[PDB]
């Protein structure tokens, strides 16, 4: 269950959603699955919202067990999109839909691709086939106001603010990744090694991080460990049951230390009330000698092709 706002019980599918400037205003909008909704509006001929009553906490995730969504405060690729940290791309005809996930009835599903993040949307009164390749009409969606089970998030992903690295570091990580995965030739169509003869696209369960360069760093053996920062992004402001504080109220509550909050908030910021968001903190990869605070980190399924020797 959520971080700010309980699941939304929306009035009409034809109402539009405002662009808010507050941090907690957006964190709430993410709780009410408003962001996935806008995406579908902006992109797929969708009418209305998604996440009815259930909200963001009630979305379906590909691996049936899914550790990171158990912590309400880890950001998904869509949640990280809604705060500008990345872009969930519109699917291209070429973008490969991994098999495994239960696409039947889904109006939006998303997965990380090797060079970015790709999500899939459906139009009015439609939902995804069981293959994922087609939206056949589902009259159980014609209300336009769909529950959170119509939203699918593939992979066990976390997204966090990233201290960005010199490309020199990235080339050196990129190289090591090829050395642990010598056999893979192309991932999601992006050249990973250079190959003569390449196999058929196969399914691929993999660890990776987004370090913010040309593509992710897939890792076989590595070490992850979490540290809590108590930062300004780690605290949310609200009036209980009335929603989140406005942008002005928020900027003030955190800088003039004159609002309320929990012990962890007061310990660092002094004392609308703002408290610590439930997450283990921020993850720090340790891979092939180096330490990196990545943008996103996760265990997804992508489409890799292999070497024919």
């Amino acid at each position: 269950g959520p971080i700010i706002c309980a699941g939304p019980i929306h009035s009409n599918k034809s109402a539009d959603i405002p662009h808010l400037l507050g941090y907690s205003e957006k964190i709430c909008q993410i709780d009410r699955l408003i962001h996935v909704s806008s995406w579908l509006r902006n992109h797929s001929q969708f009418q209305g919202y998604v996440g009815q009553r259930g909200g963001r906490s009630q979305v379906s995730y590909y691996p049936a067990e899914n550790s990171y969504s158990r912590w309400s405060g880890l950001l998904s690729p869509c949640d990280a999109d809604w705060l500008g940290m990345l872009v969930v791309k519109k699917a291209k005809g070429s973008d490969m839909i991994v098999p495994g996930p239960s696409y039947k009835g889904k109006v939006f599903f998303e997965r990380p691709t090797f060079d970015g993040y790709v999500g899939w949307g459906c139009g009015s009164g439609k939902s995804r086939t069981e293959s994922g390749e087609l939206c056949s009409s589902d009259s159980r969606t014609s209300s336009g106001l769909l529950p959170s089970d119509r939203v699918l998030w593939i992979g066990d992903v976390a997204c966090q603010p990233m201290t960005p690295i010199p490309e020199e570091t990235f080339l050196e990580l990129k190289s090591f990744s090829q050395s642990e995965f010598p056999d893979i030739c192309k991932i999601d169509g992006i050249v990973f090694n250079q190959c003569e003869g390449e196999s058929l696209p196969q399914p691929f369960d993999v660890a990776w991080m987004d370090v913010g360069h040309s593509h992710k760093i897939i890792m076989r053996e590595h070490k992850t460990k979490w540290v809590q920062e108590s930062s300004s992004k780690d605290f949310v402001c609200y009036k209980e049951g009335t929603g989140p504080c406005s942008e002005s109220e928020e900027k003030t509550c955190k800088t003039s230390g004159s609002c309320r909050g929990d012990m962890q908030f007061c310990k660092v910021a002094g004392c609308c009330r703002c408290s610590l968001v439930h997450k283990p903190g921020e993850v720090v990869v340790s891979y092939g000698g180096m330490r990196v605070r990545p943008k996103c980190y996760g265990f997804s399924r992508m489409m890799a092709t292999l070497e024919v020797s």
Partner: antibody
Amino acid sequence: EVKLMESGGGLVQPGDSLRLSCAISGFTFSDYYMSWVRQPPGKALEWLGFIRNKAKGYTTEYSASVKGRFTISRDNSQSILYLQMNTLRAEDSATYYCARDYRYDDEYYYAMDYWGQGTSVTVSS
Amino acid sequence: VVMTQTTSSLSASLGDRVTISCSASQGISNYLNWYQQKPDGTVKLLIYYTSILHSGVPSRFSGSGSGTDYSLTISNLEPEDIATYYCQQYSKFPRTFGGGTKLEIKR
């Protein structure tokens, strides 16, 4: 006392090749990456490429400006860094420095902390 | 990435504080170094990672900055400090240097 001394520049004709070299004093050569940097006359320092250390197994990287014509290489036995300049061209003429760079991966502190004196190359017809 | 040193030359008087300013075509997330070249041609490292002083550099030197804007500051121009000052970034692949800033004395 970390010392670098470039050598081998001169006046060569376009198309010619010419090899520059950089001699090392005062520090364990195989430990450090090394970069070649050139400074066209009446211009600013251009960075050209580098050769990693023994730890990262003597890999190289090259700026787009000269990829496929130049070649950095080291000779751990003699403590010498070489820049190999093939298919030279009028734009290549400049003075060429080599410099050892300091790397602190844990913090991403990468900087060229000791420099040669420069060797001058002029490519002209 | 394209670095710009705002002023090609920069006049000053011995003893007072001087500031050379470096501006980047895009945010370089503090991966910025400062070198000083003297007329003999010699080059030395001064500051790496925006503010960290290279070994054996005097304390009157300091640099600072963020995002796309960075600056080097000598607190007492001393005659040896008369030299061209080059900044250089390492967030993106082709390490790129500024255009320099040569220091002239006011009379």
